[PDB]
Write a protein that binds this ligand. Structure first.
Ligand SMILES: Nc1ncnc2c1ncn2[C@@H]1O[C@H](CSCc2cc(C(=O)O)cc(-c3cccc(O)c3)c2)[C@@H](O)[C@H]1O
Ligand SMILES: [Zn+2]
Ligand SMILES: [Zn+2]
Lengths: 115, 296
């Protein structure tokens, strides 16, 4: 019944004042993109930074299994848009936040479906 | 000024010289370029390499097959393949490799010495960043280097599709004469220096549109001496200007034709299409790769 919970350990390490995971791969891009959360090529808008997806995945970066039956990664091989104000910790951002299945935007960071 | 280009390519006249090899002494050796906020050198370097490759007659087929050697960093990620994957058409098969473990956005990654890497298919583009710092022995004769360059030369000859292209990193001390000679088996070639790393003797040796036979005879010791002579006498102003305009970055999907011809069918007519970036010659089967593992 045991299973390591890296997501919780990272969140708790962040709360206790630990320096975020560094060296996420930030891309050069126009910053005139759609602003959607996870895309096949960089799509940052003016308020976002675009990063290589694998470098922003906690499980990829810690060399641990992805938490789902088929150990599939929804970040690897794609680009993740991170709000510029949160770009100091892209790994924590993707962990804590959710993508609207209709917008493609981050809930509370671009999704306007609830208006 | 060349400060608004992505970098500087070795002028043809320097290629035609017969200089003797001397030590590389760069005027701007001390300086660094000012990178945009939070951008890594290797993202900026690969961005400029790709911007320059946009100006060449690269064959861009459907199912482009690209392989990238030396793709890891000492922090375990792959910034170069992230740029290649941004650059290449969506759906391009991108394979990654390095001696040391790293996580990657490539479709497949092999860890181990490049000599352990084998592929069944041929490739449309080969990118290499491999480099051994132990070659920078300024206290001794700068001879042609073996090691991964031996693998790269054979890999080009055996697994590069006719019409495909190559960009292989060299430096003052990290270079190989046969690789220079192999440049004469392409329709065109150059040594390209990124503007962002112009204080380094690094260049990418680029072979554009592989022909599978010698189009010209190149002595590789002479050509590396010519390359150093050019770098020694032509200071390049460090610059990150081209990084701020990415509006035209993506590689144009040309839909270049792919055909399976054997050898006797490659006319001067075919060689001509190859030379213009309009043809790729290889099978288009499944892509299968493997890494050799030594057991005790
Ligand atoms: N035979 C091979 N097969 C497969 N992969 C190969 C092979 N040789 C090399 N590589 C891979 O190429 C990537 C680029 S070299 C990065 C570097 C640059 C500098 C530079 O600029 O001063 C310096 C180093 C360096 C610095 C201090 C100590 C040290 O030990 C090294 C490293 C790299 O991840 C390395 O593992
Ligand atoms: Zn992952
Ligand atoms: Zn929404």
């Amino acid at each position: 019944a045991f299973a390591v919970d890296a997501a919780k350990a990272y969140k708790d390490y962040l709360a206790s004042g630990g320096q975020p995971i560094t060296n996420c791969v930030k891309m050069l891009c126009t910053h005139t993109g759609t602003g959607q959360a996870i895309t096949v090529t960089p799509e940052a808008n003016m308020d976002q930074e675009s990063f290589g997806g694998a470098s922003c995945c906690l499980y990829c970066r810690c060399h641990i299994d992805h938490p789902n039956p088929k150990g599939f990664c929804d970040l690897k091989g794609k680009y993740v848009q991170i709000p510029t104000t949160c770009a100091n910790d892209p790994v924590g951002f993707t962990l804590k936040n959710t993508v609207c299945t209709v917008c493609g935007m981050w809930k509370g960071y671009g999704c306007s479906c609830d208006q | 000024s060349q400060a608004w280009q992505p970098g500087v390519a070795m002028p043809n006249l320097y290629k035609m010289q017969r200089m003797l090899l001397e030590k590389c002494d760069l005027q701007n050796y001390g300086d660094s370029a000012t990178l945009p906020k939070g951008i890594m050198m290797n993202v900026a370097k690969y961005t400029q390499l790709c911007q320059y490759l946009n100006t060449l007659t690269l064959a861009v087929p459907y199912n482009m097959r690209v392989i990238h050697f030396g793709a890891g960093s000492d922090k375990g990620v792959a910034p170069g393949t992230a740029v290649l994957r941004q650059w290449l058409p969506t759906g391009t098969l991108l394979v990654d490799s390095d001696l040391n473990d790293f996580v990657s956005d490539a479709d497949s990654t092999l860890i181990g010495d490049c000599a352990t890497v084998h592929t069944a298919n041929k490739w449309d583009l080969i990118i290499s960043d491999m480099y051994d710092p132990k070659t920078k022995n300024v206290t001794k004769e700068n001879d042609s280097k073996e090691g991964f360059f031996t693998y790269i030369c054979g890999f080009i000859q055996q697994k590069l599709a006719l019409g495909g292209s190559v960009a292989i990193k060299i430096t003052e001390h990290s270079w190989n004469a046969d690789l220079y000679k192999l440049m004469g088996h392409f329709a065109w070639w150059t040594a390209f220096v990124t503007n962002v790393n112009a204080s380094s003797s690094e260049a990418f040796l680029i072979g554009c549109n592989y022909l599978g036979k010698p189009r010209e005879q190149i002595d590789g010791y002479v050509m590396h001496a010519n390359y150093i002579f050019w770098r020694n006498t032509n200071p390049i102003q460090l610059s990150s200007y081209s990084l701020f305009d990415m509006s035209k970055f993506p590689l144009k999907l040309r839909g270049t034709a792919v055909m399976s011809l054997k050898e006797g069918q490659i006319n001067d007519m075919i060689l001509s299409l190859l030379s213009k970036g309009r043809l790729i010659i290889r099978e288009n089967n499944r892509v299968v790769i493997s890494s050799d593992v030594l057991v005790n």
